[PDB]
Design a protein around this ligand. Structure first.
Ligand SMILES: Nc1ncnc2c1ncn2[C@@H]1O[C@H](COP(=O)(O)OP(=O)(O)OP(=O)(O)O)[C@@H](O)[C@H]1O
Ligand SMILES: Nc1ncnc2c1ncn2[C@@H]1O[C@H](COP(=O)(O)OP(=O)(O)O)[C@@H](O)[C@H]1O
Lengths: 823, 403, 400, 237, 127
């Protein structure tokens, strides 16, 4: 083999130089290495020739006398070790080396030096803190090089590897901080909890420094630290940032209780209370012309019975939800409930409240007449309708608390159930001390039935979701202890762990104390309760241990039938890491293999986890798999598959999916048990005319709203065993979607808070270039007026650089101000 | 200047990321697990029928095991050739067999007919089960078509063509006067030809106006096929299916390949076409005249073969149209405007004048374009959307003439 | 004989960086963890059996009656109780299966088992691994998305609207009562065409896709060229409603030749059958036929008419911004240089198409990998221009 | 089928059509009116180091007030110029008044029509275009299709890239932007400059100032006008 | 596809002429280099069979006029007649103007005759 003539000549020249450097006398050692190093650091701004001289160069470096000659020798060994590395010999030589300016030895060398520093920083033991400072100083020298030469994302990699994101704040300038913070946010989804909080805290630090509060609030909501949310809300002072914070709290649904000393406090609490949510939503619905009450009959396509009529009423309420415009239950509503049979009048009135949800003024007046109804079920449904109306939306005088005064602890089981569920939906996320101090004593009542006690626990859990309310947990545990185990573990105690999971939602770690106190409970219910509270607390964390513990326990034979907790393990499989697309599309495939070879109880609970992964997101593979498994032999499996399709298509108005359900309705026309819930799935698909989505992931589909997932999980827990409970009595548990029902369109205001007709470009927004933490790139600009339905996969962007939003996140509400360069 | 060996490995290790080798090992393990879990399947059994048939229909499979000695008369099945005066049956078998048997005592000689497939029991080859297959390939399922074609306003009524064919198709099906007042049988045939256009729409209208003996749309291009005898058999089963379906009309369409051109290149170019011609004449010769079945042949040009002079005794009454005038075009506009969300307040007569002899297909096309322009404007209204109706119809007439 | 294929692969192609970094590493670790937890889950579940119930009721009743010896044969016809099956060497059996009878999966023309001796069907080979006569659905629903192409916003919006008239808002023209399968007639320079394919993948993000390129001047006596596509489009209607991409045959296979008779029978058959299928009054289905060509002149007058084939779309040459976007897309995977030499290569360039952009980007890496191997080769700033000349544009004597 | 000078079954004249499509092989050619000056350019980009640039002759004069440019086959074009020049000298011999641009364009179109007629003669696959000041002051531009016809155009835009440059011209053919001679020249540039790279010296412009001789713009002045066009492009952010 | 000489292509090319010009590349080899105070031609003698006598004194190089000389590279049958016509044109100009014919004018006349040969009539192009 024959190299280039000049390449061979230079190779022989370097061979002569190294032999001269390898000679006996050291008087020529210095001149030889002076000549050598100049061309060694030539190609980096050569290394092939000195490939077989590894041992000789090591001997020369060791033989070199201490001083200048030795540290250049260590310099040459280091810059050559990047090729001849059987170990991190580059860094060990460089630590012995000069420690002068390294950045001039080529980009390849400094990048390899940066990584070896990261390896040593991780490798060094706790007792070794001598060399840590020199590596930190070396890191603080290479970060400016990475910032200049667009290497900031790997600079973030090494600083997070060495846990020095605190000085990442001090070094990064705003000119490139947006992509660094986006890179941090992406890493947040996968890093475990202690460094996850560390990256969240530093992300707040960067945005607080750079006056980037609107996205900082998004990150604060990820941190679920209400104290930090209050601190950063105080930190920002401008009127524009104050009012966008209140939209974000209002859109999230959690009410922030503050003082009137702040400027424009009345508007801030109003927009946080979502008082104008209903007015804007109806106004945009009218502007789209989507206001006509869609009859359940022509949804069914009847061109070719008491429970079936009930399902028709429920889907009508789902379609006309948040609207308040439906004469079917308003004019002849009394006739319909009178014609209705048995237990369905409560749900029909609650469905009417679903039509009137978020319509406080309109709903209360139109439900006042039905409040004085004769039947106990109608009265209870009317009271539940009031709670649905006041659910989500906050009010200054809070009419729900005064309206539900005698019914909060009323002796009648049905009347108490409606009020308790109504207060739970109303005070969901309010965390109000007065509401808690009035409903927890109702939890302590012994006259209430087992299911009534469970509903009280559900209400307490959704009110105090993600609050770690100690007295709520103590009452929950005390009520469980007082109740006898034999009657506890029958079919309805499954709500008590749900309240515990909601109260400790997104916290973790401390759950060991709760499960230790719960350890006294017998195995059939303890093994279910401890798993449910664990998965709910560790939801949205990517803790793939908690899923594999679920996978291990749901694998057991478990065949009195304690194997029911295999189902909550399946729900926990999706619940832990439903956050991003990864951890959801593959746990989806896990559910496929669960159905592919699994227990009857396992395959009963799998569609519930499938719906939890992609609620309101009609993924084609999900819809096909659910449709194929909707005809399984097990009736409960078919029921779960029917409901799963309704949830994944909920609030989408997906035409082809609706056709599939209509085909399923024809298939299941003979059996009403599947038929009425196929109708239910269609109503879920057309719920709110598709204007309100049901996915609990908001703020660019990366924030977990505690109230919405609380109500969603309550429905899925109920749908663990609907083969018994929806057939029997739980026609009221389906109304937990109010928390998860949030609008998915854009409402644009201005600095004077008036609706703007500003047009935006909307289309698929998926990553194209991954060279750095670049913002998600949108394609398919189908621009039109600002009311646009924001679904999964596709986002919105301003048509021109003329209106500057308060936050680049474009969903729900946003204020657009005139750009200084607008012309 | 290749300088690759050794050098390429060094520069492959020259740069990279700090853990590029790590992710490579990670993704190789990802692919290793992917193959392992594709090998570690779920239902790892190609044979299906796991339990729904293997729990209760299995219990009756015990019954068929108790009756396993019977129900074994399957063996092999083959056609029959002919027979003697009565008892003996000389048969050609798919085993090339010169086969004769005493027909099984359970089977009378009346049921078995020449050219029908019968299974033979290997022990004695008795005529046990004479299967009437009546198997239809997928293309034949296309030759047969829907019966209820649904009636319209004479599908853009061209009063000449329809009224000439009603006395030859509708009247014989009504059978009010064919027997006595007019000579024995109605006119022997109908040739509803014409340029691409109104052809066969009047046939569909006559099908809807008549009884359930409804037409099937067969294509001559489909009928001509590779090899020899397949087209002959296809025409035979075409007549069999039409005869069985209440003696329905047989609608031959695009007769320019089944009859071919007026010539054959060397009598070897299109000879299977000639094979189909001989058998089709043998089928639609009628033999004994019968006012039950009807036949209609529709092409665009009179390119029929030499039987074009025998057909005056068999296939007479050649009629055509496909020449819509102003009154024809505006009536086609009215029946098409019956569909969609349009109303006749539009001055559609102006557009009928604009397009001279625009068939009925283009008028349907123009109406389709008008609906497409309405949805493009996002207005589902079309009753009063007449100016927009006129605008889209005239601009597309411009595009059709010159684009 | 074919309905669907098990899609349990393509594990989350959304690797956001696509380059070696810590974020990509963590995503791969989460991917690889999720694979083991599944292999955990299924293995833990398959062996930790819920219950040991005899011989799973399999070997007790059916496996013995299925027998050890078996032979495979096709199933021909179905009767109420028995089954008419055409086994090997032209044998036909009229026997009632009652063991492992999955009536949905047996179907006519599928391989079934025969237990020998008293020949009774006892099972069906559902895989059968041999539906190989005419295969065009093998490339169905291509994974290419909108993001793969850029700078073609006007055409992407136009094609999306033409194909989202169905699926999205199907009641729009359902109330208008037209149900138009007009399709799209695509123009474009000969330097493009698979963009006519790449812009088609925008609609291929929904449902399946079929391709007929080159085919033939259907000399076949049966013709059936456009007619088996009609059957395949019918099969597409059985599946998710697919599109038929017939680029370069709407021009050659459907040519506006002045000759009337004696014209290879394609004008007699192909053009007429194309119009019959493109007319909504004959065939239903949400199938949209995308007609793409590089010769607008050869448009047949039947194909010219927007009355049956509407939604004419013209593909123009890329502009300066479009050239910047396509070069960015093609060079994003390769990390061209740290100096980002982007506009110098396109500012003066004219009449450069997508295929040329891909070729020059590929040749830029090849020339650097030839001997200039420097990771992000510092020569790439001008070698990209060195291989953008590359001659090979057009060559024909002198004549000038 | 048939590709000779006979009528086809659908009409047309396919040999004539092929000749009309042959102009695409060639070079761009732009030119404008303005009542002060007619200027036309070609923008040739092919010059090897060993060929003399003198004899490209993409634009040529006829009678020191009429000039024509190439679009298509060069040999046919040169024969056309020779015959047309002979005819201009004949129409100067008889009818002593100098030739008019319309007259010479009519003669060229008549010759092309004659050659399209009959099967013997190839239909002169060249598309010519002629500018020049008439005897009565008014400068005119005619463009002759190869078949038989000529048309008086404000802008010609003939050759490769003809469609795009013609669209650009008709988009902003502002008479207020015509006005002065320099404005006219700078309007021809940045329009012909748009075609292909046009980087260093590809533009080959020509000038006819009223009664002056055919002026071929010097390369340095061409670069000066390009710089002025760049200056106009600047300050437009 | 080729036919009688006076045709075009569906694209619009003179493929007969292009084929002839490409065929000119095949066979024969001449080169001309221009320098100050002298311009020269170099020709490759194709057939060097020892059985020739080289009495024509020139095969590729032809003296066409007092002030010019040419070198053909095509088929000799057309080359001879083309050289004769070129000499005739040069001498006709000399007779008419009593002055040596400029080289550009002579070349334009020859290329005009070749363009005429490839333009009209059923005559082969001068290869
Ligand atoms: N008189 C008419 N009135 C209304 N629509 C017509 C009329 N004639 C033709 N059409 C329309 O033309 C289309 C096809 O017409 P038709 O079924 O008669 O012909 P075909 O079978 O397609 O063949 P061909 O055009 O060669 O006769 C249909 O959309 C039909 O509505
Ligand atoms: N504007 C573009 N952006 C991104 N990719 C493109 C673009 N144009 C073409 N491509 C890609 O380059 C390939 C060749 O494109 P195209 O020009 O359509 O091929 P051809 O010229 O061979 O018909 C296609 O497969 C397509 O994916």
């Amino acid at each position: 083999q024959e190299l280039s003539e000049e390449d061979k000549q230079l190779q022989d020249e370097l061979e002569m130089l190294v032999e001269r450097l390898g000679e006996k006398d050291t008087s020529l050692y210095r001149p030889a290495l002076e000549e050598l190093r100049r061309q060694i650091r030539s190609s980096t701004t050569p290394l092939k020739f000195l490939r077989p001289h590894y041992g000789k160069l090591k001997e020369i470096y060791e033989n070199m006398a201490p001083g200048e000659n030795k540290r250049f020798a260590a310099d040459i060994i280091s810059v050559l070790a990047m090729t001849m590395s059987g170990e991190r010999e580059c860094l060990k030589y460089r630590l012995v080396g000069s420690q002068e300016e390294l950045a001039s030895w080529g980009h390849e060398y400094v990048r390899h030096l940066a990584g070896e520093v990261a390896k040593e920083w991780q490798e060094l033991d706790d007792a070794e803190k001598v060399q840590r400072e020199p590596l930190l100083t070396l890191v603080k020298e290479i970060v400016p090089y990475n910032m200049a030469h667009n290497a900031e994302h790997e600079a973030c990699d090494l600083l997070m590897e060495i846990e020095q994101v605190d000085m990442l704040e001090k070094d990064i300038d705003e000119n490139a901080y947006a992509k660094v913070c986006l890179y941090l946010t992406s890493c947040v989804n996968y890093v475990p909890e202690p460094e996850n909080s560390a990256l969240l805290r530093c992300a707040l630090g960067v945005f607080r420094k750079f006056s980037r509060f609107p996205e900082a609030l998004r990150l604060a909501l990820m941190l679920n630290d209400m104290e930090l949310v209050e601190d950063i809300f105080t930190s920002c002072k401008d009127v524009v940032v104050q009012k966008q914070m209140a939209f974000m709290l209002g859109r999230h649904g959690v009410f922030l209780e503050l003082s009137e000393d702040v400027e424009e406090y009345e508007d801030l609490t109003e927009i946080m209370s979502n008082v104008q949510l209903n007015s804007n939503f109806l106004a945009l619905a009218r502007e789209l012309d989507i206001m006509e009450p869609k009859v359940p009959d022509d949804i069914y396509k009847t061109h070719l019975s008491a429970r079936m009529n009930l399902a028709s009423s429920f889907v009508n309420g789902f379609v006309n939800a948040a609207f308040g415009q439906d004469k079917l239950l308003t004019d002849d509503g009394n006739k319909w409930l009178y014609k209705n049979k048995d237990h369905g009048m409560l749900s029909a009135a609650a469905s009417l409240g679903m039509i009137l949800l978020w319509d406080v003024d309109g709903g209360l007046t139109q439900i006042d007449k039905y409040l004085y109804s004769s039947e106990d079920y109608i009265k209870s449904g009317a009271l539940l309708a009031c709670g649905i109306v006041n659910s989500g939306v906050r009010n200054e005088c809070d009419p729900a608390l005064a309206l539900l005064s005698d019914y909060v602890l009323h002796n009648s089981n049905t009347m108490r159930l409606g009020s308790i569920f109504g207060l739970g939906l109303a005070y969901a996320g309010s965390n109000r001390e007065d509401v808690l101090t009035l409903l927890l004593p109702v939890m302590g009542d012994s006259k209430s039935s087992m299911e009534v006690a469970g509903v009280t626990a559900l209400a307490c859990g959704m009110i105090a979701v993600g609050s770690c309310n100690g007295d709520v947990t103590s009452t929950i545990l005390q009520t469980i202890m007082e109740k006898s185990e034999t009657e506890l573990k029958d079919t309805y105690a499954r709500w008590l762990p749900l309240g515990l999971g909601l109260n400790h939602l997104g916290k973790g770690e401390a759950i060991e104390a709760i499960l230790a106190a719960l350890e006294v409970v017998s195995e059939p219910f303890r093994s279910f309760a401890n798993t449910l509270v664990d998965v709910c607390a560790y939801a949205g964390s990517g803790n793939v241990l908690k899923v594999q513990q679920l996978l291990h326990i749901c694998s057991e034979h478990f065949d009195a039938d304690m194997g029911a907790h295999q189902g909550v393990a399946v729900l926990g499989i999706a619940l832990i890491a439903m956050g991003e697309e990864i951890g959801a599309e593959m746990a989806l495939r896990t559910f496929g293999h669960l159905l592919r070879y699994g227990e009857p109880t396992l395959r009963r609970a799998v569609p519930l986890a499938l719906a939890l992964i992609s609620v309101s997101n009609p993924r084609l593979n999900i819809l096909d798999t659910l449709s194929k498994f909707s005809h399984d032999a097990d009736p409960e499996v078919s029921y779960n598959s029917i409901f799963a399709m309704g949830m994944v298509g909920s609030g989408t108005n997906n035409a082809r999916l609706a056709a599939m359900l209509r085909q399923l309705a024809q298939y299941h026309a003979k059996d009403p048990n599947n038929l009425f819930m196929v109708r239910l799935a269609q109503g879920l698909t057309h719920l709110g005319k598709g204007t309100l989505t049901l996915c609990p992931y908001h703020s660019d589909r990366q924030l977990m709203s505690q109230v919405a997932v609380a109500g969603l999980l309550t429905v899925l827990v109920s749908f663990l065993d609907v083969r018994n409970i929806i057939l029997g009595k739980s026609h009221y548990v389906l109304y937990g979607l109010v928390a998860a029902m949030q609008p998915r369109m854009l409402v644009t205001f201005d600095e004077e808070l008036r609706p703007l007709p500003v047009s935006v470009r909307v289309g698929q927004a998926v990553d194209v270039v991954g060279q750095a933490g670049k913002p998600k790139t949108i394609t398919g600009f189908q621009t039109h007026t600002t009311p646009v339905l924001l679904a999964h996969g596709e986002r919105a962007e301003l048509a021109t650089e003329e209106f500057l939003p308060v936050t680049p996140i474009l969903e729900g509400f946003v204020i657009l101000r005139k750009n200084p360069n607008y012309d | 200047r290749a300088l690759d060996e050794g050098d390429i490995a060094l520069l492959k290790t020259y740069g990279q990321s700090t853990y590029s080798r790590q992710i490579k090992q990670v993704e190789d393990d990802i692919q290793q697990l992917l193959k392992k879990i594709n090998e570690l399947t779920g239902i790892k059994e190609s044979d299906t029928g796991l339990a729904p048939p293997a729990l209760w229909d299995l219990a009756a499979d015990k019954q068929t095991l108790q009756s396993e000695q019977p129900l074994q008369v399957a063996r092999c099945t083959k056609i029959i050739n002919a027979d003697s005066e009565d008892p003996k049956y000389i048969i050609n078998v798919k085993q090339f067999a010169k086969f004769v048997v005493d027909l099984s005592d359970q089977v009378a000689p009346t049921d078995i007919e020449e050219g029908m497939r019968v299974g033979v029991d290997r022990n004695k080859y008795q005529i046990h089960i004479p299967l009437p297959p009546k198997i239809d390939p997928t293309v034949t399922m296309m030759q047969v078509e829907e019966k209820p074609d649904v009636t319209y306003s004479d599908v853009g009524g061209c009063k000449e063509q329809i009224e000439k064919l009603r006395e030859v198709v509708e009247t014989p099906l009504l059978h009010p006067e064919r027997f006595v007042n007019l000579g024995i049988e109605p006119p022997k045939g109908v040739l509803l030809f014409g340029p691409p256009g109104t052809g066969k729409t009047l046939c569909a209208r006559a099908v809807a106006n008549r009884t359930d003996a409804c037409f099937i749309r067969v294509i001559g291009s489909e009928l001509v096929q590779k090899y020899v005898g397949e087209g002959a058999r296809m025409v035979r089963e075409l007549f069999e299916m039409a005869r069985t379906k209440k003696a329905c009309l047989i609608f031959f369409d695009e007769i320019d390949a089944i009859g071919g051109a007026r010539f054959d290149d060397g009598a070897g170019g299109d000879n299977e076409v000639q094979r189909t011609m001989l058998e089709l004449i043998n089928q639609l010769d009628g033999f004994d005249p019968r006012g039950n079945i009807k036949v209609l042949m529709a092409t665009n040009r009179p390119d029929t073969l030499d039987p074009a002079l025998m057909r005056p005794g068999r296939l007479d009454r050649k009629i055509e149209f496909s020449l819509p005038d102003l009154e024809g075009r505006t009536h086609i506009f009215k029946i098409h405007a019956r569909s969609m969300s349009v109303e006749r307040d539009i001055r559609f007569e102006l557009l009928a004048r604009l397009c001279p002899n625009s068939t009925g297909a283009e008028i349907r096309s123009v109406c389709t374009e008008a609906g497409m322009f309405a949805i493009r404007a996002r207005r589902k209204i079309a009753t009063e959307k007449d100016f927009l109706e006129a605008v889209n119809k005239v601009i597309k007439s411009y595009a059709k003439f010159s684009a | 004989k074919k309905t669907k294929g098990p899609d349990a692969a393509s594990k989350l192609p959304l690797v956001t960086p696509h380059t070696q970094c810590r974020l990509k590493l963590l995503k791969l670790e989460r991917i690889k963890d999720y694979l083991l937890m599944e292999e955990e889950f299924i293995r833990n579940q398959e062996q930790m059996k819920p219950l040991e119930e005899k011989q799973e009721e399999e070997r007790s009743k059916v496996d013995d009656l299925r027998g050890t010896p078996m032979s495979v044969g096709t199933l021909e016809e179905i009767i109420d109780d028995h089954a008419i099956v055409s086994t090997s060497v032209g044998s036909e059996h009229y026997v009632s299966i009652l063991s492992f009878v999955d009536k949905d999966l047996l179907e006519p023309g599928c391989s079934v088992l025969l237990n020998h001796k008293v020949h009774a069907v006892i099972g069906v080979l559902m895989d059968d691994t041999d539906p190989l006569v005419t295969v065009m659905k093998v490339e169905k629903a291509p994974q290419e998305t909108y993001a793969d192409i850029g700078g073609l916003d006007n055409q992407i919006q136009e094609i999306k609207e033409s194909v989202e008239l169905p699926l999205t808002h199907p009641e729009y023209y359902e109330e208008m009562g037209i149900k138009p399968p007009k399709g799209v007639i695509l123009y474009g320079p000969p330097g493009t065409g698979k963009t006519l394919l790449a812009k088609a993948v925008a609609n291929q993000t929904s449902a399946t896709f079929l391709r007929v390129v080159g085919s033939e001047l259907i000399q076949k006596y049966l013709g059936d060229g456009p007619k088996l596509v009609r059957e395949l489009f019918r099969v597409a209607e059985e599946h998710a409603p697919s599109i038929v991409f017939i680029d370069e045959i709407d021009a050659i296979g459907t040519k506006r030749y002045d000759s009337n008779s004696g014209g290879e029978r394609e004008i007699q058959r192909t053009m007429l059958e194309l119009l019959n299928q493109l007319d909504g009054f004959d065939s239903r289905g949400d199938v949209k036929v995308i007609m793409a060509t590089n010769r607008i002149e050869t448009l047949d007058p039947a194909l010219i008419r927007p009355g049956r084939i509407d939604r004419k779309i013209e593909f123009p040459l890329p502009d300066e911004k479009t050239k910047k976007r396509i070069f960015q897309i093609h060079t994003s995977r390769m990390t061209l240089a740290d100096d980002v030499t982007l506009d110098d290569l396109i500012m003066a360039k004219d009449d450069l198409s997508g295929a040329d952009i891909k070729a020059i980007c590929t040749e830029a890496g090849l020339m650097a990998l030839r001997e200039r191997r420097m990771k992000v080769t510092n020569e790439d700033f001008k070698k990209s221009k060195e291989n953008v000349l590359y001659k090979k544009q057009e060559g024909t004597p002198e004549g000038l | 089928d048939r590709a000779i000078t006979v009528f086809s079954p659908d009409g047309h004249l396919f040999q004539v059509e092929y000749a009309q499509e042959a102009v695409k092989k060639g070079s761009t050619a732009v030119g404008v009116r303005g009542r002060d000056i007619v200027v036309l350019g070609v923008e040739k980009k092919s010059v090897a180091k060993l060929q003399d640039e003198r004899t490209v002759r993409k634009i040529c004069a006829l009678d020191d007030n009429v000039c024509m440019a190439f679009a298509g086959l060069t040999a046919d074009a040169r024969i056309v110029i020779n015959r047309a020049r002979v005819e201009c000298q004949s129409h100067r011999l008889t009818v002593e008044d100098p030739v008019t641009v319309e007259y010479i364009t009519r003669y060229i179109a008549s010759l092309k029509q004659r050659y399209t007629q009959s099967n013997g003669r190839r239909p002169f696959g060249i598309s010519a275009l002629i500018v020049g000041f008439d005897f009565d002051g008014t400068p005119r531009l005619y463009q002759t299709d190869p078949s038989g016809t000529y048309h008086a155009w404000k802008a010609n835009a003939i050759g490769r890239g003809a469609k795009s440059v013609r669209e650009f011209l008709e988009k902003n053919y502002t008479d207020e932007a015509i006005e002065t001679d320099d404005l006219t020249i700078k309007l021809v540039i940045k329009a012909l400059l748009e075609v292909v790279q046009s980087g260093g010296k590809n533009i080959e412009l020509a000038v006819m100032r009223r009664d002056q001789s055919l002026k071929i713009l010097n390369p340095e002045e061409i670069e000066k006008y390009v710089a002025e066009i760049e200056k106009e492009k600047e300050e437009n952010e | 596809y080729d036919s009688r000489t006076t045709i075009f292509s569906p694209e619009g090319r003179l493929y007969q002429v292009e084929y002839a010009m490409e065929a000119i590349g095949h066979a024969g080899t001449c080169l001309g280099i221009l320098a100050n105070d002298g311009v020269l031609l170099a020709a490759e003698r194709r057939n060097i069979h020892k059985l020739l006598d080289e009495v024509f004194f020139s095969e590729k190089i032809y003296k066409l006029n007092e002030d010019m000389a040419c070198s053909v590279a095509g088929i000799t049958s057309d080359a001879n007649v083309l050289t004769n016509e070129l000499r005739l044109i040069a001498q006709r100009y000399l007779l008419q103007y009593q002055e040596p014919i400029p080289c550009e004018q002579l070349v334009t006349a020859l290329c005009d005759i070749k363009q005429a040969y490839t333009q009209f009539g059923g005559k082969r192009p001068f290869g």
